[PDB]
């Protein structure tokens, strides 16, 4: 068989993702994909899988562990890592370019992430000044 070990990371949700041949396993953090209460963010993961097509999907076992604090953010990290896992697998330009055309959140992370909370002038929020009325 084969072990290929890939990562995706979106907004510091970090996906440790393995693809091996098998039977159609979808595992996230130990549990089936099914557990997730949200429908919506499940439909984000499913998008690289359908675009390659279900044939490959059935033929391989993808286990991921997506260790990110967002529920959207997990969906996000898992979608980038699946897209990359799929492209390493078959190895063709066909699947890579197809992905680039559809969206670039499937195979690029972000160039930034966060900004600190600036010191401020005794007021909350990193880009904020104390209200005035002194005129």
């Amino acid at each position: 068989m084969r072990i290929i070990q890939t990562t995706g990371k979106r907004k510091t949700a970090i996906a440790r993702a393995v693809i091996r041949e098998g039977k159609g396993r979808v595992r996230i953090n130990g549990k089936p994909v099914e557990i997730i209460e949200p429908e919506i963010a499940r439909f984000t993961i499913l998008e690289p899988l359908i675009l390659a097509g279900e044939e490959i999907w059935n033929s391989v076992d993808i286990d991921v562990k997506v260790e990110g604090g967002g529920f959207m953010g997990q969906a996000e990290a898992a979608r980038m890592a699946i897209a990359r896992a799929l492209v390493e697998w078959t190895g063709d330009m066909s699947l890579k370019e197809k992905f680039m055309k559809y969206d670039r959140t499937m195979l690029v992370g972000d160039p930034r992430r966060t900004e600190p909370h600036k010191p401020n002038r005794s007021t909350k929020g990193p880009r904020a000044k104390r209200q005035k009325s002194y005129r």
């Binding site: 010191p119 401020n120 002038r121 005794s122 000044k129």
Partner: protein
């Protein structure tokens, strides 16, 4: 023999690296079997401060940083063997803690 843990932690980046590298290099050839120097953290201490004693105006506020960075060594040797390696100069301000167990 006794397995001895040298834990070495320091405030600056410069000093801790010289010690770890030299400990491993002195230790390498002799009765010693040594496990490679391992970095443990900077627990990075923030101390977040107000500048101005006034409290008044805009304030521009201080982000501080004290970094203390930890490297952890196992060595297998006698107690006599440990002192020999310990001989080194060491950067002022380098804490060296020793654990001795069989």
């Amino acid at each position: 023999m006794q397995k001895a843990r040298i834990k070495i932690a320091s405030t600056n980046v410069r000093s801790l690296d010289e010690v770890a590298n030299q400990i491993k290099q002195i230790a390498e050839r002799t009765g010693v079997r040594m496990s490679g120097p391992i970095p443990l953290p900077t627990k990075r201490i923030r101390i977040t401060t107000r500048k101005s004693p006034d409290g008044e105006g805009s304030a521009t506020f201080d982000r501080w940083e004290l970094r203390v960075h930890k490297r952890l060594i196992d060595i297998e040797a006698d107690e006599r063997a440990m002192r020999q390696i310990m001989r080194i100069r060491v950067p002022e301000d380098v804490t060296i803690e020793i654990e001795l167990i069989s």
